[PDB]
Write an enzyme that holds these catalytic residues in place. Structure first.
Site, PDB file in Angstrom:
ATOM      1  N   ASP A 150      46.372  47.452  36.719  1.00 54.00           N
ATOM      2  CA  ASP A 150      45.286  46.811  37.471  1.00 54.00           C
ATOM      3  C   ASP A 150      44.027  47.693  37.487  1.00 54.00           C
ATOM      4  O   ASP A 150      42.903  47.189  37.445  1.00 54.00           O
ATOM      5  CB  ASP A 150      45.740  46.495  38.909  1.00 54.00           C
ATOM      6  CG  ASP A 150      45.081  45.243  39.481  1.00 54.00           C
ATOM      7  OD1 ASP A 150      44.370  44.539  38.733  1.00 54.00           O
ATOM      8  OD2 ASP A 150      45.290  44.946  40.683  1.00 54.00           O
TER       9      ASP A 150
ATOM     10  N   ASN B  85      40.929  49.577  33.369  1.00 55.13           N
ATOM     11  CA  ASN B  85      39.653  49.378  32.657  1.00 55.13           C
ATOM     12  C   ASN B  85      38.995  50.680  32.198  1.00 55.13           C
ATOM     13  O   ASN B  85      38.585  50.786  31.039  1.00 55.13           O
ATOM     14  CB  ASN B  85      38.644  48.581  33.505  1.00 55.13           C
ATOM     15  CG  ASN B  85      39.167  47.224  33.922  1.00 55.13           C
ATOM     16  OD1 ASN B  85      39.907  46.577  33.184  1.00 55.13           O
ATOM     17  ND2 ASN B  85      38.785  46.787  35.115  1.00 55.13           N
TER      18      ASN B  85
ATOM     19  N   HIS C 187      49.511  37.852  39.307  1.00 51.87           N
ATOM     20  CA  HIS C 187      49.056  38.767  40.362  1.00 51.87           C
ATOM     21  C   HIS C 187      47.696  38.455  40.975  1.00 51.87           C
ATOM     22  O   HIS C 187      47.450  38.856  42.106  1.00 51.87           O
ATOM     23  CB  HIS C 187      49.074  40.224  39.879  1.00 51.87           C
ATOM     24  CG  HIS C 187      47.783  40.692  39.281  1.00 51.87           C
ATOM     25  ND1 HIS C 187      47.408  40.393  37.989  1.00 51.87           N
ATOM     26  CD2 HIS C 187      46.793  41.463  39.793  1.00 51.87           C
ATOM     27  CE1 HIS C 187      46.235  40.948  37.738  1.00 51.87           C
ATOM     28  NE2 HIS C 187      45.840  41.605  38.814  1.00 51.87           N
ATOM     29  N   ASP C 188      46.816  37.769  40.244  1.00 46.41           N
ATOM     30  CA  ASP C 188      45.502  37.375  40.776  1.00 46.41           C
ATOM     31  C   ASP C 188      45.252  35.856  40.726  1.00 46.41           C
ATOM     32  O   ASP C 188      44.128  35.410  40.968  1.00 46.41           O
ATOM     33  CB  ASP C 188      44.383  38.103  40.008  1.00 46.41           C
ATOM     34  CG  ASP C 188      44.108  39.507  40.538  1.00 46.41           C
ATOM     35  OD1 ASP C 188      44.277  39.758  41.756  1.00 46.41           O
ATOM     36  OD2 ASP C 188      43.701  40.367  39.730  1.00 46.41           O
TER      37      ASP C 188
ATOM     38  N   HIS D 174      37.992  38.281  38.036  1.00 43.63           N
ATOM     39  CA  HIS D 174      39.380  37.948  38.383  1.00 43.63           C
ATOM     40  C   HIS D 174      39.840  36.607  37.823  1.00 43.63           C
ATOM     41  O   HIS D 174      40.174  35.683  38.564  1.00 43.63           O
ATOM     42  CB  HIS D 174      39.589  38.029  39.893  1.00 43.63           C
ATOM     43  CG  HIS D 174      39.513  39.424  40.420  1.00 43.63           C
ATOM     44  ND1 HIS D 174      38.438  39.885  41.145  1.00 43.63           N
ATOM     45  CD2 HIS D 174      40.361  40.472  40.295  1.00 43.63           C
ATOM     46  CE1 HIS D 174      38.633  41.150  41.461  1.00 43.63           C
ATOM     47  NE2 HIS D 174      39.792  41.534  40.958  1.00 43.63           N
TER      48      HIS D 174
ATOM     49  N   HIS E 234      41.425  38.870  32.724  1.00 41.99           N
ATOM     50  CA  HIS E 234      41.911  40.004  33.517  1.00 41.99           C
ATOM     51  C   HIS E 234      43.420  39.926  33.684  1.00 41.99           C
ATOM     52  O   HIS E 234      44.116  40.935  33.553  1.00 41.99           O
ATOM     53  CB  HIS E 234      41.256  40.054  34.894  1.00 41.99           C
ATOM     54  CG  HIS E 234      41.874  41.058  35.816  1.00 41.99           C
ATOM     55  ND1 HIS E 234      41.764  42.418  35.620  1.00 41.99           N
ATOM     56  CD2 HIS E 234      42.622  40.900  36.932  1.00 41.99           C
ATOM     57  CE1 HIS E 234      42.416  43.053  36.577  1.00 41.99           C
ATOM     58  NE2 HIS E 234      42.947  42.156  37.386  1.00 41.99           N
TER      59      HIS E 234
ATOM     60  N   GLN F  23      30.956  54.310  39.224  1.00 38.56           N
ATOM     61  CA  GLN F  23      32.051  54.441  38.284  1.00 38.56           C
ATOM     62  C   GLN F  23      32.509  55.881  38.148  1.00 38.56           C
ATOM     63  O   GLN F  23      33.708  56.133  38.032  1.00 38.56           O
ATOM     64  CB  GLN F  23      31.654  53.865  36.923  1.00 38.56           C
ATOM     65  CG  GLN F  23      31.518  52.355  36.936  1.00 38.56           C
ATOM     66  CD  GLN F  23      32.824  51.658  37.281  1.00 38.56           C
ATOM     67  OE1 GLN F  23      33.874  51.962  36.705  1.00 38.56           O
ATOM     68  NE2 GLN F  23      32.766  50.723  38.231  1.00 38.56           N
TER      69      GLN F  23
ATOM     70  N   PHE G 183      34.371  56.287  41.211  1.00 38.67           N
ATOM     71  CA  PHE G 183      35.595  55.516  41.027  1.00 38.67           C
ATOM     72  C   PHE G 183      36.635  56.331  40.267  1.00 38.67           C
ATOM     73  O   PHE G 183      37.796  56.405  40.680  1.00 38.67           O
ATOM     74  CB  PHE G 183      35.278  54.215  40.276  1.00 38.67           C
ATOM     75  CG  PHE G 183      36.457  53.276  40.113  1.00 38.67           C
ATOM     76  CD1 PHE G 183      37.381  53.081  41.136  1.00 38.67           C
ATOM     77  CD2 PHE G 183      36.611  52.549  38.938  1.00 38.67           C
ATOM     78  CE1 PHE G 183      38.442  52.207  40.977  1.00 38.67           C
ATOM     79  CE2 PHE G 183      37.671  51.675  38.781  1.00 38.67           C
ATOM     80  CZ  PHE G 183      38.586  51.505  39.803  1.00 38.67           C
TER      81      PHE G 183
HETATM   82  C1  LIG Z   1      34.955  48.946  36.639  1.00 37.66           C
HETATM   83  O1  LIG Z   1      34.842  48.851  38.058  1.00 37.66           O
HETATM   84  C2  LIG Z   1      35.913  48.540  38.861  1.00 37.66           C
HETATM   85  C3  LIG Z   1      37.101  47.992  38.354  1.00 37.66           C
HETATM   86  C4  LIG Z   1      38.196  47.675  39.169  1.00 37.66           C
HETATM   87  C5  LIG Z   1      38.189  47.880  40.551  1.00 37.66           C
HETATM   88  C6  LIG Z   1      39.402  47.531  41.398  1.00 37.66           C
HETATM   89  C7  LIG Z   1      39.007  46.570  42.492  1.00 37.66           C
HETATM   90  C8  LIG Z   1      38.893  45.217  42.204  1.00 37.66           C
HETATM   91  C9  LIG Z   1      38.517  44.329  43.209  1.00 37.66           C
HETATM   92  C10 LIG Z   1      38.251  44.751  44.515  1.00 37.66           C
HETATM   93  N1  LIG Z   1      37.872  43.757  45.374  1.00 37.66           N
HETATM   94  C11 LIG Z   1      37.370  43.804  46.629  1.00 37.66           C
HETATM   95  N2  LIG Z   1      37.244  44.877  47.424  1.00 37.66           N
HETATM   96  O2  LIG Z   1      36.964  42.742  47.072  1.00 37.66           O
HETATM   97  C12 LIG Z   1      38.362  46.120  44.790  1.00 37.66           C
HETATM   98  C13 LIG Z   1      38.743  47.016  43.789  1.00 37.66           C
HETATM   99  C14 LIG Z   1      36.971  48.454  41.177  1.00 37.66           C
HETATM  100  F1  LIG Z   1      36.888  48.681  42.502  1.00 37.66           F
HETATM  101  C15 LIG Z   1      35.816  48.797  40.318  1.00 37.66           C
HETATM  102  C16 LIG Z   1      34.618  49.361  40.987  1.00 37.66           C
HETATM  103  C17 LIG Z   1      33.385  48.725  40.898  1.00 37.66           C
HETATM  104  C18 LIG Z   1      32.291  49.264  41.564  1.00 37.66           C
HETATM  105  C19 LIG Z   1      32.429  50.424  42.330  1.00 37.66           C
HETATM  106  C20 LIG Z   1      33.666  51.057  42.433  1.00 37.66           C
HETATM  107  N3  LIG Z   1      33.824  52.231  43.196  1.00 37.66           N
HETATM  108  O3  LIG Z   1      32.891  52.690  43.846  1.00 37.66           O
HETATM  109  O4  LIG Z   1      35.054  52.893  43.221  1.00 37.66           O
HETATM  110  C21 LIG Z   1      34.758  50.512  41.758  1.00 37.66           C
HETATM  111 MG   LIG Z   2      44.282  41.828  43.456  1.00 40.22          MG
HETATM  112 ZN   LIG Z   3      44.006  42.461  39.250  1.00 42.43          ZN
END
Ligand SMILES: COc1ccc(Cc2ccc(NC(N)=O)cc2)c(F)c1-c1cccc([N+](=O)[O-])c1
Ligand SMILES: [Mg+2]
Ligand SMILES: [Zn+2]
EC number: 3.1.4.53
Length: 340
Positions: free
Chosen positions: A236, A239, A118-119, A78, A82, A287, A290
């Protein structure tokens, strides 16, 4: 007025500014860790935002550098890179054929600016972490969208530093409109609003209506802002839709941040957050989960809204998913993070 070799190599990379798959990390290296500033600058000229809003160039560069400086260089995900990425991704989503001439310059300014702030000042830990640990930010914002409220506040507050007010020439009517739109957008990046954001987008698709030759039709503020909220949210969570070498770098970076938070929870004798246990974790299973459960449903609905402009993006998502697939805590991560 002749550029260096480094400024030129940078200039040539910035010719990809309208392309999904911009080598964003190399722009970070070529600018001296100023990816947010040069990408924001390039996008503002491109879209002629300096002339439309009578923003002095020196004031704009001073603000962008100040904003970027309040992104944490020691936070692996972050950070300013990003930030730059979400900005640039939004810029590309804004340019899509189905949204040609739909949005006003003020709206465009809101979406781009909001992506930039935003971050800002993210400490690399989660909202829930901040709440449980009793941090000042949590108390400050009464445990409600803690980080997201803080990002907005710092983003707007930095307008007041020396020669930073990039909106100094807008009317009060414009400033109030910009502000509200920027707040509505950044607040909707709270991950726990995802299903509510996805539900609205689905409704917008199921009932979608089109103008002469292809262009989307948005008749009221609600529908207009909901598309912009989902646009930046898509950026957001973009990726996994990028080329793999880029996607892989973001995965590395997010996991390092996650494990670092897990390390701090374990130190303290806390219950370790889902996906933050470095001794017990599957990046690869995560992932895939995800993409299947969050990323693909979102981007499929976006692809339906703007059909067919996003098929290549959505193909890349499906390909990357199959790549990771060929390589419980995942469930808990998704429930805790993307549900209200
Ligand atoms: C490439 O990997 C990701 C990229 C962006 C986000 C969005 C995001 C960012 C920060 C938080 N921050 C928090 N919660 O503190 C939460 C979500 C993700 F989540 C993952 C991600 C990573 C590990 C497991 C999972 N999964 O199991 O879906 C998703
Ligand atoms: Mg955020
Ligand atoms: Zn972000």
């Amino acid at each position: 007025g002749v550029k260096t070799e480094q400024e030129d190599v940078l200039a040539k990379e910035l010719e990809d500014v309208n392309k999904w798959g911009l080598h964003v990390f190399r722009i970070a290296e070529l600018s001296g860790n100023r990816p947010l500033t040069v990408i924001m600058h390039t996008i503002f000229q491109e879209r002629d935002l300096l002339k439309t809003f009578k923003i002095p160039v020196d004031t704009l560069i001073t603000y962008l550098m100040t904003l970027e400086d309040h992104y944490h260089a020691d936070v692996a995900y972050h950070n300013n890179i990003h930030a730059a990425d979400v900005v640039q991704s939004t810029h590309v989503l804004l340019s899509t054929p189905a949204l040609e001439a739909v949005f006003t310059d003020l709206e465009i300014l809101a979406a781009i600016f909001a992506s930039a702030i935003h971050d800002v000042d993210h400490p690399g830990v989660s909202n829930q972490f901040l709440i449980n640990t009793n941090s000042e930010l949590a108390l400050m914002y009464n445990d409600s969208s803690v980080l997201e409220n803080h990002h907005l506040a710092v983003g707007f507050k930095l307008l007041q530093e020396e020669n930073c007010d990039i909106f100094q020439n807008l009317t009060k009517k414009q400033r109030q409109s910009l502000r509200k739109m920027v707040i509505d957008i950044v607040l909707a990046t709270d991950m726990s609003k995802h299903m509510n954001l996805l539900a609205d987008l689905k409704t917008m698709v199921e009932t979608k209506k089109v103008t002469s030759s292809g262009v989307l039709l948005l008749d009221n503020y609600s529908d207009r802002i909901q598309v912009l909220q989902n646009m930046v949210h898509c950026a957001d969570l973009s990726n996994p839709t990028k080329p793999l070498q880029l996607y892989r770098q973001w995965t590395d970076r997010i996991m390092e941040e996650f494990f670092r938070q897990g390390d701090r929870e374990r130190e303290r004798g806390m219950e370790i957050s889902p996906m933050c246990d470095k001794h017990n974790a599957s990046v690869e299973k995560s992932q895939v989960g995800f993409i299947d459960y969050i990323v693909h449903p979102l981007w499929e609905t976006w692809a339906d809204l703007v059909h067919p402009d996003a098929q290549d993006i959505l193909d890349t998502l499906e390909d990357n998913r199959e790549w990771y697939q060929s390589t419980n805590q995942v469930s808990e991560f998704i429930s805790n993070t993307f549900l209200d």
